[PDB]
Design a protein around this ligand. Sequence first.
Ligand code: HEM
Ligand code: HEM
Ligand SMILES: CN(C)Cc1cccc(OCc2ccc3ccc(N)nc3c2)c1
Ligand SMILES: CN(C)Cc1cccc(OCc2ccc3ccc(N)nc3c2)c1
Ligand SMILES: C[C@H](O)[C@H](O)[C@H]1CNc2nc(N)[nH]c(=O)c2N1
Ligand SMILES: C[C@H](O)[C@H](O)[C@H]1CNc2nc(N)[nH]c(=O)c2N1
Ligand SMILES: [Zn+2]
Lengths: 411, 407
Amino acid sequence: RFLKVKNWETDVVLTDTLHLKSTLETGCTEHICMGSIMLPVRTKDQLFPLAKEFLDQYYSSIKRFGSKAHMDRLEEVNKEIESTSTYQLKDTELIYGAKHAWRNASRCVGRIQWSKLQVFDARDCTTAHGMFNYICNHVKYATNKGNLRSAITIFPQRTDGKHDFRVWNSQLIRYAGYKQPDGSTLGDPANVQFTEICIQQGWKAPRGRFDVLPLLLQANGNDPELFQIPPELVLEVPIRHPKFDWFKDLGLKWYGLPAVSNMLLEIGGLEFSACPFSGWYMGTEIGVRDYCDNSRYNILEEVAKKMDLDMRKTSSLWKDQALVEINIAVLYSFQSDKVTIVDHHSATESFIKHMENEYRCRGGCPADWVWIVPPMSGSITPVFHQEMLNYRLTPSFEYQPDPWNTHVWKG
Amino acid sequence: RFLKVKNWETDVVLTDTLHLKSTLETGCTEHICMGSIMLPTKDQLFPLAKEFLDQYYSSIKRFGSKAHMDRLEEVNKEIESTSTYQLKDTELIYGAKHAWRNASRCVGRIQWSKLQVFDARDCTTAHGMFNYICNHVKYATNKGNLRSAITIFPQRTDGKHDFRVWNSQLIRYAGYKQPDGSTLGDPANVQFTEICIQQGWKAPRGRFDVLPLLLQANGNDPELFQIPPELVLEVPIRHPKFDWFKDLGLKWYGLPAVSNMLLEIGGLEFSACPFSGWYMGTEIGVRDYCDNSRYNILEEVAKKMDLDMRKTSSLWKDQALVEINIAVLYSFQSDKVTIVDHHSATESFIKHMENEYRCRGGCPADWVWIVPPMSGSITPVFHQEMLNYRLTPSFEYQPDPWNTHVW
Ligand code: HEM
Ligand code: HEM
Ligand SMILES: CN(C)Cc1cccc(OCc2ccc3ccc(N)nc3c2)c1
Ligand SMILES: CN(C)Cc1cccc(OCc2ccc3ccc(N)nc3c2)c1
Ligand SMILES: C[C@H](O)[C@H](O)[C@H]1CNc2nc(N)[nH]c(=O)c2N1
Ligand SMILES: C[C@H](O)[C@H](O)[C@H]1CNc2nc(N)[nH]c(=O)c2N1
Ligand SMILES: [Zn+2]
């Protein structure tokens, strides 16, 4: 069965066969679409088919399908599962899996860069302190003095689900949020709950508006431990506007390395519950979501006041106006400091090319339109008018419950 | 089976049951989501009629009454006899209001119960259709104080006697492919501005030329009619800041009147059913003015603003796009022509959404279409999970007549 998507701006039609190789479920049925829902201990019984499916893909990509190396590997993995109820990936397999998980991320606009992922293998790690050391080396390598490089560090896989490695932070670098007695929040509102835990775990909070959160790391199912990232390793960027001089006086800065640390890497049925990865920012991630979301720093108001906007009627589009200037500042500041960043026009443009190429060479590209389209200026980027098919391929990145909800405290 | 949706900006959770009454299909499967795709007999007819009549009579607190059971019987007979059937006026009004209420892609549904329905089922000719359409346009416009309306022409019979309005909206601007190879006027309507000539329109080959109506009645060849200009209310577009804005020579019409959809009620098919409301500002300013495949005036507007159009990262398209939209809203409001901004509309939609969850058990909604084409995440709908499903009565797409019409 074939499927076609159409770009309504350019009339380009593409044909999808890759969706046939789709395993997981979307959430949708013939009767209902869950396309806008944010979120839609494994037995040997169900592990070997997963392992085979992965190994077959892998040996196909290297053009050794049905070879002796391929067959011997199947058998080696077979014997290891029935003997140990799990298996270990070669370095070759691990790198491949990590890159492909990224490649299969239907919600990712940055996938053009997927082949260039730096993979650090942290599967020999046994402690939190070890975890800290690995993460530090990730942060330094990825940051590269502002010249950002995509990387992922991969800690040991889940075994019986009772010995999990987890990074408790949602991103390796993020600012504290503190709820005040009056109800106002100091810092980043998204991180209030997490900041509380850290403080309770013994963090001494500087209690400013831009405090870098400490790392909270869990090894082999043990209680998590606090570590402070060396500040010389945390690249931060002061935010100024190229025309508005009072902008600097807003006192804003952001960090340069976006590094998501709370997802789950599934490769060949194996589960990697700590797999922090990093790229670089699309400007609107900071400029629209981080600053101007109502449930974040929410500086639309103050930026608007200082612009002397008519904030009386909403039909004056004072929010829209201010939002654009803030995004202008973000790109400006980052580029001035020679810290890698991409604008949403450039990023979405690059994605359409990636997507077309993926259709030609791979037979499809799963994409989630709800997430690919940027959170401002939607229709003036080319992804808006691009039809997309969504489906799930493995290897993949998955969500997981927050660790403070599932963890069994030792003491 | 009892689904929940969360708003991630407000933590509010609504539960959906209404989806369980869904009849049609989505395009999607358990293996693949098509959410972003634009377009996904006697024994057929009675169950359809019954389903409608059941929900109709339930809505007036007379489910299983004499009237209800009598009516089911009555319609059963007419179907068995005539192979089709006719709606009572009450049912027709209820059906139209509900086709709108069920339009999952429509952000403006808070107004759904206040629809004026004009029954034009007694119409026989293109000249007839023209008269009814002029009356619709005058009523709806209401000297700028816009009122929602729909005009309903006779239902399909055997697909050979179809009434169709060939225009995609009752009011739209002409577009002509030039020897220069570019495009004057509105590029969306180049093919249609052509067909108007193939049937003999005398195009004043200009820019904002109001297209003539091309009406087909009872399956006959369509005929051209020119809407009286005094019935077409227009708004000159000026910026409340940039005096040079007026120089761009821009205007738009106030009445958005969609005329190419198919209204389905209780199994019956109304292929000519032009309906109208009022614009959300971004429909004109973001899409009509700035789409690459439309008036595409971004380049020009940014130039008069003297923005650095050298690098995409200056966000000059963004800055200009906003100004353009400010003007549109400003012009309409200053001319006392009804319009709504995307902030207000989306806010009203969350309210409507909450009402529908409360008094109906839900609200089918297509996020890809509800979220405005600019400033997405600064409107409340961006953070609103929605469920999409197909309820009936409904408005459906239908092929362009020229691709179909037996000539
Ligand atoms: C290198 C530059 C990159 C850019 C510019 C980029 C951009 C983005 C953006 C804007 C989103 C949407 C996030 C949101 O608004 O919530 C996203 C999502 C995502 N990215 Fe990329 N990304 C990059 C690299 C990466 C890398 C290196 C990986 C994995 C190794 C990755 C995996 C993902 C995944 C799995 C999601 C979806 C998150 C979710 O499902 O909640 N991205 N990306
Ligand atoms: C009165 C104020 C109204 C507002 C503000 C409004 C707004 C909108 C908007 C913004 C869209 C998105 C379409 C696009 O961007 O191209 C839309 C679609 C739609 N509207 Fe409403 N509308 C209104 C009245 C009506 C009425 C009176 C009807 C029918 C009786 C209606 C039926 C529909 C339908 C069926 C769609 C989706 C059509 C499609 O699938 O393309 N709307 N509306
Ligand atoms: C706190 N979590 C539950 C929410 C969450 C967890 C993980 C990922 C996520 O999506 C945002 C995201 C993920 C990966 C990215 C990679 C590069 C980049 N520039 N931005 C990203 C942005 C959102
Ligand atoms: C040529 N066709 C693709 C145009 C077309 C056909 C069918 C539906 C359609 O949807 C746009 C639409 C529909 C109804 C509306 C009602 C009020 C309003 N302000 N805008 C609307 C906008 C647009
Ligand atoms: C490809 C995609 O389905 C298409 O561009 C859709 C996206 N969302 C839209 N949303 C609205 N309101 N109107 C549209 O025409 C579209 N077009
Ligand atoms: C309700 C919806 O699922 C949710 O708000 C989504 C919408 N689209 C998004 N798109 C991106 N890139 N990031 C997001 O967090 C979201 N949030
Ligand atoms: Zn779907």
